[PDB]
């Protein structure tokens, strides 16, 4: 069921949406996103996995995060997967995406804020139940309180509304995980000639213990994660344990109890402890972003992606996909530090396509680097 939404409020904007069930194949959803709605295959997918809690980020940290994310996404064509609900970090991030879209003089690269929200958490769903192809449904925007129901953000251009699964109350999370896994196995460009595998990345902002299962499932699907240093929720636990260097059951139990005193369930605490241990067992898929120190989100994104790929395999072909990504963002220093450091042998035939991409994309630093490297 596909329909268009005409938001009514301060700014009149038109947005698309589709109702989808938990039994749907993600291939169909990706196909309709790419073709039916005319969205080009993204060069970068960033998924927000938090910010819906009662506690919110500081306005300075929120603004830094939104500015860094938009700046990193504007280099190429990026998708920002969030819950299409006007609340928390999602509202401000969608507003920043919309502001960048209006102010972008080059429509060649587009930052699209996709919204995946549960159907039962939609305010005035009957208003959009019409979905007349000739007349798009009119939807009013209201800043509801925390509660348990929100209104769709008008700044998200496209939506993926998922119905609740009668089996388990995790339909939206499973759908998000499946969509991320399916997107991670696609090609960046229209054809598989000079196109790379789509880099899918997840961002954590003040997670709750309920999302640990979904985070571990994503890690099992082998997609990198970025953790905010000063987020507030599970992000603090993860960054503290990684700073400590080693994780033990007592330490993580104590930290989880201190950060979430309201959570008092022995089985739940043990399950969360096991989930955290298995999550940290990977490590190469985990990365810390500290806006106070680095504040360069694109640098952290590239470092996380190349770290994940390098941990995956040592073949030079694996780095070549990462090398193209490093070229695309004109981060020659990151490429020199990570890809071109001793271990990886690089033949002339290997660098032919990458040299073409650097030459035709007006990146002279990479041209010099490739000439200097055989």
């Amino acid at each position: 069921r596909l329909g268009d939404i005409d938001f009514t409020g301060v700014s009149r904007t038109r947005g698309k949406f589709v109702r989808v069930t938990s039994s749907t194949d993600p291939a169909e959803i990706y196909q309709i996103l790419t073709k039916q709605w005319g969205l080009a295959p993204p060069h970068l997918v960033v998924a927000l996995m938090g910010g819906d809690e009662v506690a919110q980020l500081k306005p300075w940290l929120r603004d830094t995060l939104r500015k860094g994310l938009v700046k990193a996404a504007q280099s190429t064509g990026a998708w920002i997967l969030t819950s299409g609900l006007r609340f928390g970090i999602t509202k401000n991030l969608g507003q920043a995406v919309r502001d960048h879209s209006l102010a972008s003089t080059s429509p060649k690269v587009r930052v699209v804020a996709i919204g995946i929200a549960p159907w039962n958490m939609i305010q005035n769903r009957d208003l959009l139940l019409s979905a007349k192809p000739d007349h798009p449904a009119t939807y009013p925007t209201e800043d509801l309180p925390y509660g348990a129901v929100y209104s769709l953000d008008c700044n998200h251009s496209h939506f993926i509304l998922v119905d609740e699964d009668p089996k388990r109350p995790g339909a939206t999370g499973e759908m998000r995980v499946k969509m991320l896994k399916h997107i991670s196995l696609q090609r960046t460009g229209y054809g598989g000639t000079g196109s790379i595998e789509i880099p899918v990345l997840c961002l954590l902002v003040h997670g709750e213990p309920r999302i640990l299962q979904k985070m571990y499932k994503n890690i099992q699907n082998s997609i990198p994660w970025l953790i905010l240093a000063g987020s507030g929720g599970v992000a603090d636990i993860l960054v503290t344990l990684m700073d400590r260097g080693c994780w033990d059951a007592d330490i993580v139990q104590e930290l989880l109890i201190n950060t979430f005193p309201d959570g008092l369930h022995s089985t739940e605490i043990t399950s969360w402890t096991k989930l955290i241990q298995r999550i940290l067992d990977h490590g190469h898929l985990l990365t810390v972003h500290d806006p106070e120190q680095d504040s360069e989100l694109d640098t952290v994104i590239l470092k996380a992606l190349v770290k994940a790929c390098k941990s995956q395999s040592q073949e030079a072909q694996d780095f070549l996909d990462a090398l193209k990504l490093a070229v695309a963002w004109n981060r020659v220093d990151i490429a020199k530090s990570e890809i071109f450091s001793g271990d990886v042998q690089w033949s002339a035939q290997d660098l032919e396509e990458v040299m073409m991409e650097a030459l035709v994309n007006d990146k002279p630093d990479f041209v010099r680097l490739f000439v200097d490297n055989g």
């Binding site: 700014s11 009149r12 919309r98 502001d99 960048h100 209006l102 102010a103």
Partner: protein, 91 residues
């Protein structure tokens, strides 16, 4: 006086040129003594019944306001960055 004035005289000429061009925008296309035809036509049209200073649709106006805000943010960020990389601040 010539040496002191020339630079300000150029700017003042540009400022005056704005007003003169605005003045020629509304002027009838027929030079006098012909201008009487234009005056009679204008009076008859008034009795019977602007490239600059234009009004834009709501969507375009909002887009331009957001674009100007983005440009202002970029300009302020550039100023802050250039101040941070200054020799004095580095010292």
């Amino acid at each position: 006086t010539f040496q002191v004035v020339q630079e300000n005289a150029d700017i003042f000429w540009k400022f005056q040129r704005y007003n003169l061009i605005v003045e020629y925008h509304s002027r009838p296309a027929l030079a006098p003594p012909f201008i009487i035809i234009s005056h009679i036509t204008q009076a008859l049209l008034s009795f019977i019944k602007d490239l600059l200073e234009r009004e834009l649709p709501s969507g375009l106006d909002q887009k331009l306001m957001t674009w100007e805000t983005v440009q202002k943010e970029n300009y302020l960020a550039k100023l802050e960055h250039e101040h941070r990389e200054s020799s004095g601040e580095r010292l």
